[PDB]
Amino acid sequence: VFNLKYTVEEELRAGTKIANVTADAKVAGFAPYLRVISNSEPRWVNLSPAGLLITKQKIDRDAVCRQTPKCFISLEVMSNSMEICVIKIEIIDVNDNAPRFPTNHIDIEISENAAPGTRFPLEGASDPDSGSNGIQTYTITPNDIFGLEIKTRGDGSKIAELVVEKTLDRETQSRYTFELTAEDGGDPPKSGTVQLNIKVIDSNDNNPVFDEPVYTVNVLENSPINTLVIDLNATDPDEGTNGEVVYSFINFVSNLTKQMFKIDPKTGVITVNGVLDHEELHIHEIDVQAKDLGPNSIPAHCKVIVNVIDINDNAPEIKLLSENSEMVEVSENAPLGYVIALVRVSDNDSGANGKVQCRLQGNVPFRLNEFESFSTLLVDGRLDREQRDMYNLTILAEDSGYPPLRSSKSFAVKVTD
Amino acid sequence: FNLKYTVEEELRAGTKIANVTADAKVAGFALGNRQPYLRVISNSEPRWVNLSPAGLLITKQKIDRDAVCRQTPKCFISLEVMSNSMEICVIKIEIIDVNDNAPRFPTNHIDIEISENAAPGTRFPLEGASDPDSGSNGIQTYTITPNDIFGLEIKTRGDGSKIAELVVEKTLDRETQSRYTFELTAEDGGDPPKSGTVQLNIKVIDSNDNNPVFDEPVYTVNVLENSPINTLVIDLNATDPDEGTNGEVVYSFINFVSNLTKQMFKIDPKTGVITVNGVLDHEELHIHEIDVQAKDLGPNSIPAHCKVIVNVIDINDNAPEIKLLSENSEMVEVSENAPLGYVIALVRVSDNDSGANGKVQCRLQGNVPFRLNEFESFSTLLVDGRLDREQRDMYNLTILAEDSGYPPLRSSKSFAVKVTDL
Ligand SMILES: [Ca+2]
Ligand SMILES: [Ca+2]
Ligand SMILES: [Ca+2]
Ligand SMILES: [Ca+2]
Ligand SMILES: [Ca+2]
Ligand SMILES: [Ca+2]
Ligand SMILES: [Ca+2]
Ligand SMILES: [Ca+2]
Ligand SMILES: [Ca+2]
Ligand SMILES: [Ca+2]
Ligand SMILES: [Ca+2]
Ligand SMILES: [Ca+2]
Ligand SMILES: [Ca+2]
Ligand SMILES: [Ca+2]
Ligand SMILES: [Ca+2]
Ligand SMILES: [Ca+2]
Ligand SMILES: [Ca+2]
Ligand SMILES: [Ca+2]
Ligand code: NA
Ligand code: NA
């Protein structure tokens, strides 16, 4: 009641003659000669009454027991009613089934600025063959930014995972592509492969940058509403909303500044939005922020100095300084340059455009004379009042601008003794 | 013709500015017998300064120089007076500033808000104060209560005024410090350098800078086969220091794990509690490899993975099995004339259950006209008493088979056995 043993390969076509067992039954045992009782998987192996042990088909040893060492089948046979024996048939594995990959390729996503060291488990393959003939190494198309760690399992199954070697950046490289191979371990080691698409996702890692921290532009007073002041710009390399800068004024900034100026948020054009006045205020300073729409925003800023320019938008003004500012008087015997009154040569506008000169109408007994702050009305000749009591002067005064402006203070002058 | 004078501001009680009548005489002016020696024609803001019939020049108010002329290096009253008759005379009063206005912030509190992840050299502008004093009596500098992480840069503008600007001197981290409170104060250039102050509230806002750390990389806990639904395999943990949403982790499997894996195992996505969810079986499959990811709900996230190995435990749930190895399933034949060890048939003792739970003993029924003889993998039905066909043509035998497990499982197979002649 003793055993036998026989090796046959797999994937070997039908009827392939494994052993003549009638001759072997002699060589250490007893002597239809044989009757068959029990064989596992008779799909594979039939016997013959001649003692001939033949195969029935191509064996898919990989199918019925993938990735395992020694996979045999056995059977029991009886002599001419005599004692029995066990034949065991191990099915040696061929390197026929090469590495598979389920998908043809796989996409994966990684946030930029993931650390150097980060890992990603990705395992996928199939090499149904067992032992040395199974899977043994995966490997990437070698590069200086992405490496690989095979981690060897307790079974034997070589799993792998994707290490991130060097520091990452989306503004530089926004996607990578690699070829990922998977190898066998047969004398002619076979291998399929797959493409690997990496996609480097946008971290809001830059913040708005201004060209210079201070801008210094000139604009004219009483300007039209919606006239330009400056188109600002803040730069962001980041994707979409993580790079979509938006602009704003920030402080109270003199509540003037709020309603003297408008701002387009999406594009950074500071517009006029009110009656600018030199003679209200001669310079403006506006604090402008600009942040991205992303998360962890760090707004950048600037200051914009608007030097507002004087236009000649105010006439002159002539005030007469006395009791009764519509009329005055002096003597018949009034001497050389009796100062009868002072007057104000007064203008609001800056410098050039508010420098007043003033004559006196026509040929007249009264002259006029200037000093720094005001003007001295001083007589030139004398009235023999004898004939004529009064005569009502007007005083002419034009500023020195363009287009220049005027005004005139008419008043009276009788004479006494 | 010309006279220059000087008063301080905020001087009540009509203080005596000068005696123009004396100073006109010292320079040389009209000796009018007539009484209003000087006649006042013009004066900018008479509200402040009233002259006198007898040539005095007295004041009329606590003058506020900072009101009418804030932040400006000159603020003059000028007034003109004609002689008794003949000549004119311009009088000037330069009002000197004194430090009666200290700096002032608009509130008593400034709440700002920085993000973590803001680099060193990042800046923020900030309003400043209101010192309507003039010259150095105005604001000259600002200061933060000094520290190692924040500082200030004051920039001095063309106007003369000083503008402060909050710079971020060193690398920030919420997880270690989430709030700073500082004192922002603003100084004069006064003889007593007067100085008001205000609170600053930096508030470091959470960036999603951390990604879950798993307690280990490979977890390995064992569960019984046929174990019922919701019997827990392992409670997992991964840790995020970050705030709220950016902190809140969720747990799940990732790959085509094994279509079975998901059929057998749940996982609560909030807690990291992998429960059971199916008829888990040893004789189906003895170990699994569940691949768990945990990522934080929040911006520019990085996930974190681990591998839990669940060893399934063979319990004695599958029976023994007794397969007779003859062509006829239920009966067997043999001659009455047998030689005391005629092997009539074979039988399969067999059990799925691994190791000890499926190693099977097996016996006959009672009294033994025949006998069974266990070998490796199968047994052999030999004979014993070699009996007569004339008395008993047939017997109805039964085999027993009990495994070496607890609770111990047994089954049986009985059959007939007629006898012939040869
Ligand atoms: Ca095959
Ligand atoms: Ca093979
Ligand atoms: Ca292979
Ligand atoms: Ca980047
Ligand atoms: Ca950005
Ligand atoms: Ca980016
Ligand atoms: Ca104007
Ligand atoms: Ca003007
Ligand atoms: Ca003018
Ligand atoms: Ca004052
Ligand atoms: Ca003052
Ligand atoms: Ca002050
Ligand atoms: Ca941190
Ligand atoms: Ca987090
Ligand atoms: Ca954080
Ligand atoms: Ca079972
Ligand atoms: Ca079991
Ligand atoms: Ca059992
Ligand atoms: Na723009
Ligand atoms: Na947990």
Short mmCIF file of C-alpha atoms in Angstrom, two decimals, chain B:
data_model
loop_
_atom_site.label_atom_id
_atom_site.label_comp_id
_atom_site.label_asym_id
_atom_site.label_seq_id
_atom_site.Cartn_x
_atom_site.Cartn_y
_atom_site.Cartn_z
CA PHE B 1 5.09 150.83 8.70
CA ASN B 2 5.79 147.23 9.99
CA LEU B 3 5.52 145.50 13.45
CA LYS B 4 6.09 141.80 14.39
CA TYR B 5 4.74 140.19 17.59
CA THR B 6 4.39 136.79 19.26
CA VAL B 7 1.94 135.15 21.71
CA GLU B 8 1.50 131.58 22.85
CA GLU B 9 -1.83 129.83 22.26
CA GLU B 10 -4.47 128.93 24.88
CA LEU B 11 -3.76 132.04 27.01
CA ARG B 12 -6.95 133.41 28.66
CA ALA B 13 -7.81 136.64 30.42
CA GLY B 14 -6.88 138.93 27.55
CA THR B 15 -3.13 138.83 28.08
CA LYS B 16 -1.19 141.98 27.10
CA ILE B 17 0.52 141.35 23.75
CA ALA B 18 2.35 144.62 23.32
CA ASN B 19 2.26 148.38 23.63
CA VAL B 20 2.12 149.47 20.00
CA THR B 21 1.78 153.11 21.12
CA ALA B 22 5.26 152.80 22.77
CA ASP B 23 6.79 150.78 19.91
CA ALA B 24 5.47 153.27 17.35
CA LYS B 25 7.11 156.06 19.38
CA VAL B 26 10.36 154.12 19.65
CA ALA B 27 10.42 153.57 15.86
CA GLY B 28 8.88 157.02 15.18
CA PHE B 29 5.17 157.66 14.48
CA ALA B 30 2.50 160.40 14.53
CA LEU B 31 2.09 162.37 17.77
CA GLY B 32 -1.69 162.79 17.50
CA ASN B 33 -3.01 164.92 20.35
CA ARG B 34 -6.29 163.26 19.23
CA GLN B 35 -7.24 160.22 21.35
CA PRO B 36 -7.72 157.01 19.27
CA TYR B 37 -4.04 157.28 18.31
CA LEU B 38 -4.29 154.22 16.12
CA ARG B 39 -7.42 153.55 14.05
CA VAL B 40 -8.08 149.86 13.33
CA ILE B 41 -9.09 149.20 9.74
CA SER B 42 -8.44 145.50 9.18
CA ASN B 43 -7.62 142.43 11.33
CA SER B 44 -7.75 138.73 10.42
CA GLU B 45 -9.93 137.18 13.15
CA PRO B 46 -10.87 140.09 15.51
CA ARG B 47 -12.78 137.46 17.55
CA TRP B 48 -9.36 136.57 19.04
CA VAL B 49 -7.51 139.92 19.49
CA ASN B 50 -9.08 143.34 20.38
CA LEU B 51 -6.88 146.52 20.23
CA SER B 52 -7.34 149.46 22.63
CA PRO B 53 -8.05 153.21 22.30
CA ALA B 54 -4.86 153.97 24.25
CA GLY B 55 -2.69 151.84 21.96
CA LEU B 56 -2.75 148.63 24.04
CA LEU B 57 -3.08 145.30 22.29
CA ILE B 58 -4.99 142.95 24.59
CA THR B 59 -6.24 139.42 23.78
CA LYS B 60 -9.83 138.09 24.07
CA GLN B 61 -9.64 134.21 24.09
CA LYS B 62 -7.96 131.00 24.98
CA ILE B 63 -6.73 130.72 21.40
CA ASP B 64 -6.76 127.22 19.82
CA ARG B 65 -3.84 127.35 17.33
CA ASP B 66 -4.18 123.66 16.61
CA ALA B 67 -7.82 124.08 15.45
CA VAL B 68 -7.46 126.79 12.76
CA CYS B 69 -3.89 125.70 11.90
CA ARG B 70 -3.25 122.02 12.68
CA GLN B 71 0.04 120.45 11.57
CA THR B 72 1.44 123.73 9.99
CA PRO B 73 4.71 125.66 10.66
CA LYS B 74 3.12 129.15 10.84
CA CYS B 75 -0.25 130.60 11.94
CA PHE B 76 -0.37 134.42 11.88
CA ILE B 77 -2.85 137.18 12.66
CA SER B 78 -2.16 140.29 10.58
CA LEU B 79 -3.84 143.63 11.18
CA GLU B 80 -3.52 147.07 9.60
CA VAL B 81 -3.89 150.43 11.38
CA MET B 82 -3.59 153.89 9.80
CA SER B 83 -1.84 156.65 11.75
CA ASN B 84 -3.64 159.51 13.44
CA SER B 85 -3.85 160.73 9.85
CA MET B 86 -0.78 160.26 7.71
CA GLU B 87 0.83 156.78 7.44
CA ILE B 88 -0.20 153.10 7.67
CA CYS B 89 1.19 150.31 9.85
CA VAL B 90 1.01 146.50 9.39
CA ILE B 91 1.02 144.49 12.62
CA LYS B 92 1.78 140.73 12.65
CA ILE B 93 1.17 138.15 15.42
CA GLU B 94 2.86 134.71 14.98
CA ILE B 95 0.95 132.48 17.44
CA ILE B 96 3.45 130.01 19.02
CA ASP B 97 2.25 126.39 19.47
CA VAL B 98 2.42 124.62 22.83
CA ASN B 99 1.97 120.95 23.45
CA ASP B 100 -1.59 121.01 24.83
CA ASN B 101 -2.67 118.22 22.41
CA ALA B 102 -1.38 114.67 22.99
CA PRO B 103 -1.59 111.90 20.37
CA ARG B 104 -4.86 110.08 20.02
CA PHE B 105 -5.93 106.90 18.22
CA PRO B 106 -9.52 106.76 16.84
CA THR B 107 -10.74 103.99 19.14
CA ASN B 108 -9.10 102.47 22.24
CA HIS B 109 -8.71 99.18 20.32
CA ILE B 110 -7.32 97.86 16.95
CA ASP B 111 -8.42 94.37 15.87
CA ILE B 112 -6.40 93.09 12.90
CA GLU B 113 -6.16 89.50 11.60
CA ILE B 114 -3.09 87.74 10.03
CA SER B 115 -2.97 84.28 8.46
CA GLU B 116 -0.52 81.72 9.66
CA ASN B 117 1.70 80.86 6.70
CA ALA B 118 2.44 84.59 6.19
CA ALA B 119 6.16 84.80 5.56
CA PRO B 120 8.71 86.89 7.41
CA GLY B 121 8.86 90.30 5.71
CA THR B 122 5.08 90.37 5.17
CA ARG B 123 3.69 93.77 6.22
CA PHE B 124 0.38 95.42 7.16
CA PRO B 125 -0.32 99.16 7.20
CA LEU B 126 -2.19 100.75 10.09
CA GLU B 127 -3.90 104.12 10.64
CA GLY B 128 -1.89 105.92 13.28
CA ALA B 129 -2.94 108.79 15.53
CA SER B 130 -4.21 112.42 15.51
CA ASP B 131 -1.84 115.01 16.97
CA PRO B 132 -3.07 118.42 15.74
CA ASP B 133 -0.03 120.09 17.30
CA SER B 134 2.37 121.76 14.95
CA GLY B 135 6.02 120.97 14.32
CA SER B 136 7.88 118.56 16.54
CA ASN B 137 4.96 118.96 19.01
CA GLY B 138 3.23 116.65 16.50
CA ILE B 139 3.70 112.87 16.25
CA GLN B 140 7.35 111.75 15.93
CA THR B 141 7.20 107.91 16.36
CA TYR B 142 5.14 104.76 17.07
CA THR B 143 6.08 101.56 19.05
CA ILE B 144 4.86 98.02 19.70
CA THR B 145 5.50 96.47 23.14
CA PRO B 146 8.77 94.84 22.18
CA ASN B 147 9.01 91.18 21.30
CA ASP B 148 10.88 88.60 19.16
CA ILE B 149 8.14 87.75 16.55
CA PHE B 150 6.73 91.14 15.43
CA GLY B 151 8.26 94.52 14.77
CA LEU B 152 7.41 97.91 13.28
CA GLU B 153 8.72 100.08 10.45
CA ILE B 154 7.82 103.75 10.54
CA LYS B 155 8.19 105.45 7.19
CA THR B 156 8.48 109.23 7.23
CA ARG B 157 6.58 110.98 4.44
CA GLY B 158 7.17 114.25 2.52
CA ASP B 159 4.45 116.15 4.42
CA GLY B 160 6.54 115.71 7.61
CA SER B 161 4.16 113.27 9.27
CA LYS B 162 5.11 109.77 10.35
CA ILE B 163 3.36 106.58 9.14
CA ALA B 164 3.79 103.27 10.98
CA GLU B 165 3.58 99.85 9.32
CA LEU B 166 3.35 96.43 11.01
CA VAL B 167 5.97 94.00 9.77
CA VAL B 168 6.05 90.22 10.53
CA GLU B 169 9.55 89.62 11.81
CA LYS B 170 9.51 85.76 12.20
CA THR B 171 7.84 82.55 11.02
CA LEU B 172 4.34 82.09 12.45
CA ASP B 173 2.47 79.02 13.67
CA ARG B 174 -1.07 78.85 15.00
CA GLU B 175 -0.66 75.42 16.54
CA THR B 176 1.97 76.80 18.95
CA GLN B 177 0.52 80.36 19.40
CA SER B 178 -2.94 81.44 18.07
CA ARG B 179 -3.28 84.99 19.54
CA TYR B 180 -0.95 87.93 20.24
CA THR B 181 -1.99 91.12 22.02
CA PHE B 182 0.31 94.14 21.95
CA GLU B 183 0.37 97.82 22.84
CA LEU B 184 0.75 100.26 19.98
CA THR B 185 1.77 103.68 21.32
CA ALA B 186 2.48 107.09 19.64
CA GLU B 187 4.96 109.79 20.85
CA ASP B 188 5.41 113.61 20.56
CA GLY B 189 8.42 115.84 20.30
CA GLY B 190 7.17 117.90 23.24
CA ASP B 191 9.24 119.31 26.13
CA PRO B 192 7.17 116.89 28.10
CA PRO B 193 6.94 114.40 25.21
CA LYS B 194 3.15 113.67 25.45
CA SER B 195 1.97 110.27 24.20
CA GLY B 196 -1.34 108.33 23.88
CA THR B 197 -1.80 104.58 23.16
CA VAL B 198 -4.03 101.76 21.81
CA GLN B 199 -4.32 97.93 21.88
CA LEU B 200 -3.31 95.76 18.90
CA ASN B 201 -4.99 92.33 18.33
CA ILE B 202 -3.13 90.00 15.99
CA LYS B 203 -5.15 86.86 15.44
CA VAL B 204 -3.32 84.05 13.68
CA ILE B 205 -5.79 82.31 11.38
CA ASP B 206 -5.53 78.61 10.69
CA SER B 207 -3.90 77.42 7.50
CA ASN B 208 -4.34 73.74 6.72
CA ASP B 209 -0.65 73.05 7.19
CA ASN B 210 -0.94 69.56 8.75
CA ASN B 211 -1.85 66.17 7.35
CA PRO B 212 -2.99 63.24 9.57
CA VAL B 213 -0.34 61.04 11.15
CA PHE B 214 -1.40 57.38 11.67
CA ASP B 215 -0.41 55.87 15.10
CA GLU B 216 1.53 53.23 13.12
CA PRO B 217 1.79 52.20 9.39
CA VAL B 218 0.58 48.57 9.61
CA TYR B 219 -2.17 47.46 12.04
CA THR B 220 -2.91 43.68 12.44
CA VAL B 221 -5.87 42.44 14.55
CA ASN B 222 -7.68 39.04 14.36
CA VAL B 223 -11.40 38.14 14.21
CA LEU B 224 -13.43 34.90 14.36
CA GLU B 225 -14.95 33.43 11.24
CA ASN B 226 -18.74 33.43 10.87
CA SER B 227 -18.62 36.42 13.26
CA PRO B 228 -21.82 38.51 13.15
CA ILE B 229 -22.41 41.96 11.65
CA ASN B 230 -21.07 45.10 13.41
CA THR B 231 -18.51 43.15 15.54
CA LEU B 232 -15.54 45.52 15.50
CA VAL B 233 -12.21 44.68 13.89
CA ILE B 234 -10.21 47.73 14.98
CA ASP B 235 -10.76 51.42 16.00
CA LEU B 236 -8.22 53.55 14.02
CA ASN B 237 -6.81 56.98 14.74
CA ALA B 238 -5.07 59.69 12.74
CA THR B 239 -4.27 63.13 14.14
CA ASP B 240 -4.63 66.68 12.83
CA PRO B 241 -3.56 69.67 15.00
CA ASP B 242 -5.30 72.20 12.69
CA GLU B 243 -8.53 74.11 13.36
CA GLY B 244 -12.13 72.81 12.98
CA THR B 245 -12.85 71.93 9.32
CA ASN B 246 -9.11 71.87 8.41
CA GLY B 247 -8.75 69.53 11.42
CA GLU B 248 -11.81 67.22 10.87
CA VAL B 249 -10.58 63.86 9.38
CA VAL B 250 -12.62 61.30 7.51
CA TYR B 251 -11.62 57.68 7.00
CA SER B 252 -11.94 55.28 4.05
CA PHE B 253 -10.64 52.48 1.84
CA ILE B 254 -9.18 53.43 -1.57
CA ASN B 255 -8.30 50.82 -4.17
CA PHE B 256 -10.13 48.08 -5.93
CA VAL B 257 -9.27 46.70 -2.41
CA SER B 258 -10.71 43.33 -3.28
CA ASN B 259 -14.37 43.34 -4.26
CA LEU B 260 -14.82 40.95 -1.26
CA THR B 261 -13.04 43.29 1.18
CA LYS B 262 -15.81 45.87 0.89
CA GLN B 263 -18.48 43.09 0.98
CA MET B 264 -17.08 41.93 4.40
CA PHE B 265 -16.03 45.18 6.13
CA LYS B 266 -17.66 48.56 6.81
CA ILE B 267 -15.88 51.63 8.15
CA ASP B 268 -17.50 54.61 9.93
CA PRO B 269 -16.03 57.58 8.03
CA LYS B 270 -15.99 59.99 11.01
CA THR B 271 -14.50 57.78 13.76
CA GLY B 272 -12.19 55.33 11.99
CA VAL B 273 -14.15 52.36 13.31
CA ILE B 274 -13.84 49.39 10.91
CA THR B 275 -16.79 47.09 11.81
CA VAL B 276 -17.79 43.70 10.28
CA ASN B 277 -20.34 43.55 7.45
CA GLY B 278 -20.70 39.94 6.27
CA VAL B 279 -20.28 36.21 6.74
CA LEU B 280 -16.54 36.32 7.25
CA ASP B 281 -15.01 32.94 6.41
CA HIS B 282 -11.74 31.02 6.87
CA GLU B 283 -12.47 28.27 4.39
CA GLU B 284 -13.26 31.09 1.94
CA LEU B 285 -10.13 33.12 2.70
CA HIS B 286 -7.74 33.30 5.67
CA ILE B 287 -6.23 36.88 5.69
CA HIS B 288 -7.30 40.26 4.26
CA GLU B 289 -5.44 43.54 3.62
CA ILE B 290 -7.62 46.58 4.17
CA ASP B 291 -5.98 49.81 2.90
CA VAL B 292 -7.20 52.82 4.88
CA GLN B 293 -6.83 56.48 3.92
CA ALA B 294 -7.64 59.45 6.09
CA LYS B 295 -7.75 63.01 4.67
CA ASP B 296 -8.75 66.26 6.34
CA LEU B 297 -11.75 68.13 5.03
CA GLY B 298 -10.09 71.35 3.89
CA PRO B 299 -7.87 73.22 1.44
CA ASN B 300 -4.90 71.84 -0.54
CA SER B 301 -5.15 68.55 1.38
CA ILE B 302 -2.68 65.70 1.58
CA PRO B 303 -4.09 62.30 2.68
CA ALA B 304 -2.53 59.62 4.85
CA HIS B 305 -2.64 55.87 4.49
CA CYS B 306 -2.28 52.67 6.51
CA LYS B 307 -2.72 48.90 6.01
CA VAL B 308 -4.70 46.74 8.49
CA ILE B 309 -4.26 42.94 8.17
CA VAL B 310 -7.20 40.92 9.56
CA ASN B 311 -6.37 37.26 10.29
CA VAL B 312 -9.50 35.09 10.19
CA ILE B 313 -9.78 32.39 12.83
CA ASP B 314 -10.85 28.85 12.05
CA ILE B 315 -13.77 27.90 14.28
CA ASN B 316 -15.35 24.43 14.04
CA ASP B 317 -18.37 25.36 11.92
CA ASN B 318 -17.95 22.90 9.03
CA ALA B 319 -18.81 19.22 9.65
CA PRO B 320 -16.91 16.02 8.82
CA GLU B 321 -17.61 14.20 5.59
CA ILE B 322 -17.62 10.47 4.81
CA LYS B 323 -17.53 9.63 1.10
CA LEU B 324 -17.70 5.96 0.13
CA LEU B 325 -15.46 5.21 -2.92
CA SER B 326 -17.42 2.62 -4.89
CA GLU B 327 -19.37 3.05 -8.12
CA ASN B 328 -22.71 2.38 -6.35
CA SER B 329 -23.41 5.13 -3.82
CA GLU B 330 -25.50 3.12 -1.32
CA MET B 331 -24.55 -0.61 -1.64
CA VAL B 332 -21.45 -2.79 -2.17
CA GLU B 333 -20.84 -6.44 -3.22
CA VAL B 334 -18.35 -9.15 -2.19
CA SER B 335 -18.08 -12.98 -2.31
CA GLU B 336 -18.91 -15.02 0.83
CA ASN B 337 -15.57 -16.75 0.09
CA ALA B 338 -13.18 -13.92 1.10
CA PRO B 339 -9.57 -14.24 2.44
CA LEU B 340 -9.86 -12.33 5.82
CA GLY B 341 -8.43 -9.05 4.38
CA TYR B 342 -10.41 -8.46 1.19
CA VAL B 343 -10.30 -4.74 0.53
CA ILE B 344 -13.89 -4.16 -0.72
CA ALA B 345 -13.89 -0.30 -0.85
CA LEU B 346 -12.14 2.93 0.24
CA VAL B 347 -13.58 5.88 2.21
CA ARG B 348 -12.73 9.57 2.39
CA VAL B 349 -12.37 11.01 5.79
CA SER B 350 -12.20 14.75 5.03
CA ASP B 351 -12.76 18.12 6.71
CA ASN B 352 -12.33 21.69 5.47
CA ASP B 353 -11.68 23.28 8.84
CA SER B 354 -7.93 23.84 9.28
CA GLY B 355 -5.45 22.18 11.63
CA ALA B 356 -7.05 20.65 14.72
CA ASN B 357 -10.75 21.40 14.06
CA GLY B 358 -10.70 19.21 10.93
CA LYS B 359 -8.66 16.17 11.98
CA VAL B 360 -11.20 13.35 12.10
CA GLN B 361 -11.35 10.09 13.97
CA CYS B 362 -13.69 7.45 12.56
CA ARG B 363 -15.02 4.08 13.74
CA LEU B 364 -17.50 1.33 12.80
CA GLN B 365 -20.96 0.67 14.42
CA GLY B 366 -20.75 -2.06 17.17
CA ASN B 367 -19.88 -5.76 16.76
CA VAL B 368 -17.25 -6.24 14.03
CA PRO B 369 -17.81 -8.79 11.23
CA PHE B 370 -15.74 -6.31 9.18
CA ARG B 371 -13.08 -3.66 10.00
CA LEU B 372 -11.78 -0.22 8.86
CA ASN B 373 -8.09 0.74 8.58
CA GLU B 374 -7.05 4.43 8.40
CA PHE B 375 -4.06 5.42 6.24
CA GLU B 376 -2.87 8.88 5.09
CA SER B 377 -5.68 10.81 3.23
CA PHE B 378 -8.16 7.84 3.15
CA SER B 379 -9.21 4.60 4.87
CA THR B 380 -9.48 0.93 3.75
CA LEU B 381 -12.50 -1.38 4.44
CA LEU B 382 -11.00 -4.84 5.19
CA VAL B 383 -12.99 -7.91 6.49
CA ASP B 384 -12.82 -9.92 9.76
CA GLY B 385 -15.06 -12.99 10.43
CA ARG B 386 -15.65 -14.28 6.82
CA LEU B 387 -19.38 -15.00 7.13
CA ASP B 388 -21.97 -17.27 5.46
CA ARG B 389 -24.31 -16.16 2.66
CA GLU B 390 -26.81 -18.95 3.65
CA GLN B 391 -27.66 -17.34 7.01
CA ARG B 392 -27.03 -13.65 6.28
CA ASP B 393 -26.89 -12.59 2.59
CA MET B 394 -26.66 -8.89 3.59
CA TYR B 395 -25.80 -6.51 6.47
CA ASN B 396 -26.59 -2.79 6.96
CA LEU B 397 -23.33 -1.19 8.15
CA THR B 398 -22.81 2.41 9.42
CA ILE B 399 -19.59 4.49 9.66
CA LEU B 400 -19.06 7.23 12.33
CA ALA B 401 -16.72 10.25 12.01
CA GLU B 402 -16.08 12.87 14.70
CA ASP B 403 -13.57 15.72 14.35
CA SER B 404 -11.12 16.79 17.01
CA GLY B 405 -12.77 20.19 17.63
CA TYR B 406 -15.06 21.92 20.16
CA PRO B 407 -18.01 21.96 19.89
CA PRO B 408 -17.22 18.60 18.32
CA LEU B 409 -18.94 17.89 15.03
CA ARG B 410 -19.94 14.43 13.88
CA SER B 411 -21.79 12.93 10.95
CA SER B 412 -22.33 9.44 9.51
CA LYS B 413 -22.76 7.27 6.42
CA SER B 414 -24.58 3.94 6.51
CA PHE B 415 -24.98 1.45 3.65
CA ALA B 416 -25.90 -2.11 2.58
CA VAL B 417 -23.52 -5.00 1.75
CA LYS B 418 -24.92 -8.15 0.02
CA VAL B 419 -22.73 -11.32 -0.55
CA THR B 420 -22.13 -13.51 -3.71
CA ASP B 421 -20.16 -16.77 -4.45
CA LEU B 422 -16.62 -17.15 -5.84
#
